[PDB]
Design a protein around this ligand. Structure first.
Ligand SMILES: C[C@H](O)[C@@H](O)P(=O)(O)O
Ligand SMILES: C[C@H](O)[C@@H](O)P(=O)(O)O
Ligand SMILES: [Mn+2]
Ligand SMILES: [Mn+2]
Lengths: 130, 122
């Protein structure tokens, strides 16, 4: 039986450039760098983002943009703020997606490697009470 | 600030196929279903897997296999168990702790990992 989420590993062309993206927007706490030593299979870093263990590895593989996405939890009062923080870094933001009166607000946007991210307000419960 | 993970949404070509997959391996628990083709709305489902909200939507599969992945935690004693359970689904399975990498029918790379972060580092 699965205990829970282990981690999520993303692949990026420019490690350092992606790192700042994570620390600025998600207040990501870097906890490990392959540079923290000599002889590492690959250039990579591990971060803690609200509990979640996120891993970033450098590589040439590029994924085509799709609706597959990871979504983090935020509050409704912080929607504007995050939209300001994202905008202030010039990262691309998708337009408001069609809701269903009872579906909280969301912010969609990419990193530099076609990774669709989302900051979701509103909960799962409010999405089931239907 | 970010309270934590809200959910992960995956796109798949066959909703029913992926479901059986999630149930047979992750013991995924369906908790919601909608999406009416007749009313022009792609189908979707919501499962809970080890407390995590997972949304599956129907659409195109990943055109290419990359190394981006989602990993779930298990005990290192169930490694052999899950290895075989996975071989039983016939899915493409690429041969701190042990892990198991394998794809679904939409080119998503998954992994079951034994051992924790506390370990991995410290
Ligand atoms: C065994 C682990 O899954 C590693 O390959 P990581 O994805 O943390 O780089
Ligand atoms: C409001 C949610 O982000 C939905 O649109 P989902 O991505 O779970 O389909
Ligand atoms: Mn991994
Ligand atoms: Mn979503």
């Amino acid at each position: 039986m699965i205990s829970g989420l282990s981690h999520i590993t993303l692949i990026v062309k420019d490690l350092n450039k992606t790192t700042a993206f994570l620390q600025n927007i998600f207040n990501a706490e870097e906890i490990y760098s392959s540079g923290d030593k000599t002889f590492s299979l690959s250039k990579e870093k591990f971060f803690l983002i609200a509990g979640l263990w996120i891993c970033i590895m450098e590589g040439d593989s590029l994924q085509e943009r799709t609706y597959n996405h990871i979504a983090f939890q935020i509050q409704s009062e912080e929607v504007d703020e995050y939209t300001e923080r994202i905008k202030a870094l010039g990262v691309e933001m998708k337009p408001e997606r069609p809701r269903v009166q009872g579906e909280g607000r969301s912010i969609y946007f990419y990193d530099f490697d076609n990774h669709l991210f989302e900051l979701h307000a509103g909960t799962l419960e409010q999405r089931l009470k239907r």
